[PDB]
């Protein structure tokens, strides 16, 4: 009380007011945009949703006593908002419920009274007119309730708040959907609630009911219109299958599902990581590494997000598999710098033909290699080491004997030296030929590029692609 | 007061980082420790070499009586005599500043520099203050304040001067040779070497000759390199003074690879006795090794290693594994053959190399324009 009690009056009063005016003016701005000019493509629905991800999760984490988050439910318990005097009667109440809470105390939450703070706010003459207002005011208690992590009759209060909000979501898409279109708001609320519906299960069990409900919501979607609804519901259906053992259900999912080319640079980073993980495991490597690259160079405007740490983590693993030497010292950035020691030590022994060190690196860091999720190297790196040595010789030399390469690769068998290079040419490691007479392994023809149409094939991929950059940039720029 | 200080930091570096080299570095620096009133910057030299020795309290009361005499001198100057700007007050303040550099730590010196820098309205005094930061910034290898005062000199001071700046042309290349920037910028500004008298502003002239000649072979291969290192006059005399360096250039120019093999090893054992050779011991060798191979593999497309057994040096299998490490490095565009003993090169014809230069600079720009194109459009 002498030390921290003086710092108790300054935190409530001004952030209680300035946050409430922002969400009410935007909530009033969402109202006028819902009432007229529903073309809200560049409107404040996005930036307010960009606020609700960032600010409300890093500013407040508890229910904010002296009536800041706990006081919004007795503030919003008495709302009708139907007729123009009835709204102005409620507009009289908006000033009065803030003035009493701003002066004095009104109604306190003691972490148990969530049932009077969720039914009577849904009740007491509420309507269907202000649907994002009812959508946000039901989703705003979802953040501090999970973030408290107290676990004393809290899961069923989460479970009731989900099933209520999911019942409110069905009543919007089916009943009176004329010019409301809250899908830009209701998608991320569906994403954030399922994260909590998974993690709270993941404290205790699995999740199967969350996905059978997710197949139904995707079934009743996908027929109307695809505007980031089908995009975000796809990855939630795909992240769980990648979380468990099965890959076949994800494989048939990624097979036939066309895309709306509209996900606002937030799902494109995520999805191109998942399908790059899928094409890695069914051994389609060249298409995998380029779309693993495409997600990484998409949005580098993140500070230790973990995702940029993870898509970078798999990208150096797969470029070892193609023998395409992922950058031997460029991947120490100030962002990660610590998730490279199990991998800079890995690519060291992969580069040389050493195995006793490579077995030492693998056995020492095997606990790390299982935890992160890339323990699919155990079968795929013994192939890489034995093909790295024959690739280095075929790149350096031009005409080597089979006895000379068999002693160079510490193999001690000049009878399967023909077998290694036969598998090298069959797998496409190097283009060469073996003369089965006395051990002639010759290289290719004299390299001529500029005289056999090869600059045309590279340039034709460039012309048609960069005019497509132009045609996409023309059909985005003009607005009223 | 800051003149015999480039040798001290050599002797501090020579004793500290190698442990085998500890015979003579303790013998003469301990003479420089008891001299010079070196009483703040020696505890890193004292704890890491010897245990302790009692000469400490004697010089501390001498430097305290010297400080308190200089404490009472300039306060009596400012309280009795009234002049501002650049006056008897000013050169007494830099006499305190040159006391804190030679004797004291850097922390008293840096706060006296910033104090007297706003007590200046001329430019030559401000030029000398930035001379003082840049001289102590090289003494204590600070890569932090050199990012400021070099810009503050070139943009706010070095516009009224007239050839009073060649010294910090030599200081910036000294920071460039020690950081990494020893490719083409170091050899460019080391081309003009017209300074013979050595002073506060200049280092040892003999070591400046060795530094300007080790770098003048990496920037330019032979676009008339012989005009600027052989047809010179002031550089030709001082390399005529030294037998090894004059042997080192002639071995590279007349392509005596058997003794250029030896002359590179004599330089490299000499490289350990330096105070800035850290990105040199592992990078200057392999660059000069791959430069000797590259001009040797010119003018020959059917070269044999049976001729390499006597022309370049000796040995057979060492050159084979040496060339194999560099072909697999990505460099030295040539092929090697074992059972025919023909090192057949495949150097491009100034088209296929130029074809690579469009496709490497092209997609590097293309990945830049898409990453630009996705940050925008929400």
């Amino acid at each position: 009380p002498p030390g921290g009690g003086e710092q108790e009056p300054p935190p409530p009063p001004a952030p209680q007011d300035v946050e409430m005016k922002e969400e009410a003016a935007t909530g009033g701005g969402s109202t006028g945009e819902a009432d007229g000019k529903t073309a809200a493509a560049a409107a404040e629905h996005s930036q307010r949703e960009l606020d609700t991800v960032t600010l409300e999760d890093i500013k407040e984490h508890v229910k904010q006593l002296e009536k800041a988050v706990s006081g919004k439910e007795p503030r919003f318990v008495l709302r009708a908002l139907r007729m123009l005097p009835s709204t102005s009667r409620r507009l009289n109440h908006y000033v009065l419920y803030k003035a009493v809470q701003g002066f004095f105390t009104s109604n306190n939450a003691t972490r148990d009274f969530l049932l009077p703070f969720l039914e009577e706010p849904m009740d007491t003459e509420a309507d269907l007119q202000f649907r994002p207002r009812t959508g946000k005011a039901a989703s705003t208690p979802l953040l501090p309730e999970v973030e408290a992590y107290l676990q004393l009759l809290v899961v069923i209060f989460m479970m009731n708040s989900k099933r209520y909000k999911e019942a409110q979501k069905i009543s919007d898409d089916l009943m009176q959907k004329i010019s409301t279109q809250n899908r830009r708001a209701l998608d991320l609320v569906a994403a954030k609630c399922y994260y909590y519906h998974a993690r709270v299960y993941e404290f205790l069990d699995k999740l199967d009911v969350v996905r059978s409900f997710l197949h139904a919501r995707l079934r009743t979607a996908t027929l109307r219109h695809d505007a980031d609804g089908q995009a975000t519901l796809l990855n939630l259906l795909l992240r769980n299958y990648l979380h468990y053992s099965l890959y076949d259900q994800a494989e048939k999912l990624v097979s036939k599902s066309v895309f709306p080319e509209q996900a606002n640079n937030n799902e494109w980073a995520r999805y191109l990581y998942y399908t790059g993980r899928i094409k890695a495991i069914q051994l389609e490597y060249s298409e995998a590494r380029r779309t693993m690259t495409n997600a990484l160079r998409k949005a580098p405007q993140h500070t230790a997000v973990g995702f940029k740490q993870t898509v970078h983590k798999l990208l150096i693993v797969v470029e070892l598999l193609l023998g395409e030497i992922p950058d031997r010292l460029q991947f120490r950035q100030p962002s990660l710098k610590r998730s490279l020691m199990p991998y800079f030590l890995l690519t060291q022994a992969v580069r040389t033909g050493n195995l006793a060190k490579f077995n030492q690196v693998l056995d020492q860091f095997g606990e790390k290699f299982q935890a992160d999720g890339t323990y699919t190297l155990i079968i795929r790196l013994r192939h890489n080491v034995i093909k790295t040595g024959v690739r280095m010789i075929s790149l350096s030399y031009s005409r080597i004997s089979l006895a000379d390469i068999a002693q160079k690769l510490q193999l001690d068998s000049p009878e399967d030296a023909e077998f290694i290079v036969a598998k090298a040419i069959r797998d496409g490691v190097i283009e060469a030929s073996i003369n089965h007479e006395k051990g002639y392994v010759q290289s290719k023809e004299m390299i001529d590029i500029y005289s056999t149409r090869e600059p045309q094939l590279a340039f034709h991929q460039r012309i048609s692609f960069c005019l497509d950059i132009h045609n996409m940039s023309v059909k985005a720029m003009r607005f009223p | 007061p800051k003149n015999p200080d480039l040798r001290i930091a050599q002797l501090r570096f020579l004793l500290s980082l190698p442990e085998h080299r500890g015979d003579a570095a303790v013998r003469d620096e301990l003479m420089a420790a008891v001299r010079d009133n070196n009483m703040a910057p020696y505890y890193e030299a004292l704890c890491k070499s010897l245990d302790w020795q009692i000469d400490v309290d004697l010089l501390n009361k001498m430097k305290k009586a010297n400080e308190d005499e200089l404490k009472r001198l300039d306060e009596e100057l400012e309280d009795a005599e009234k002049n501002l700007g650049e006056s008897e007050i000013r050169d007494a303040m830099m006499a305190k500043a040159e006391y804190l550099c030679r004797i004291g730590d850097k922390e008293g010196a840096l706060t006296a520099f910033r104090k007297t820098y706003d007590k200046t309205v001329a430019l030559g005094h401000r030029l000398d203050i930035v001379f003082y930061l840049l001289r102590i910034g090289l003494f204590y290898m600070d890569n932090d304040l050199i990012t400021r005062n070099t810009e503050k000199a070139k943009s706010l001071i070095e516009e009224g001067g007239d050839w009073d700046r060649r010294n910090r042309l030599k200081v910036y290349q000294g920071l460039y040779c020690v950081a990494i920037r020893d490719f083409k910028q170091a050899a460019e500004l080391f081309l003009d070497t017209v300074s013979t008298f050595t002073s506060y502003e200049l280092m040892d002239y003999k070591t400046f000759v060795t530094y300007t000649v080790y770098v003048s072979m990496i920037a330019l291969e032979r676009p008339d390199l012989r005009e600027k290192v052989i047809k010179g006059a002031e550089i030709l005399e001082v390399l005529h003074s030294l037998p090894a360096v004059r042997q080192y250039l002639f071995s590279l120019y007349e392509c005596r690879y058997s003794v250029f093999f030896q002359s590179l090893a004599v330089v490299e054992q000499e490289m350990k006795k330096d105070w800035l050779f850290a990105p040199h011991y592992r990078y200057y060798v392999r660059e000069m090794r791959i430069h000797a191979y590259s001009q040797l593999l010119e003018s020959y497309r059917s070269l044999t290693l049976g001729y390499m057994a006597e022309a370049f040096g000796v040995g057979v299998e060492f050159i084979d594994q040496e060339l194999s490490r560099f072909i697999a490095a990505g460099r030295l565009h040539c092929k090697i053959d074992k059972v025919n003993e023909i090192v057949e090169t495949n150097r491009p014809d100034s088209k296929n190399w130029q074809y690579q230069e469009t496709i490497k600079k092209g997609d590097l720009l293309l990945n830049r324009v898409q990453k630009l194109s996705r940050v925008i459009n929400m």
Partner: peptide, 30 residues
């Protein structure tokens, strides 16, 4: 191949200047 490079930077710059002028007239009209 320059026409692929240059003309893509032309219309991209015209996209940036419109998307700056769009959102700034939008954020200051209300």
């Amino acid at each position: 191949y320059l026409a692929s490079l240059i003309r893509s930077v032309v219309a991209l710059h015209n996209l940036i200047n419109n998307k700056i002028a769009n959102r700034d007239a939008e954020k200051k009209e209300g």
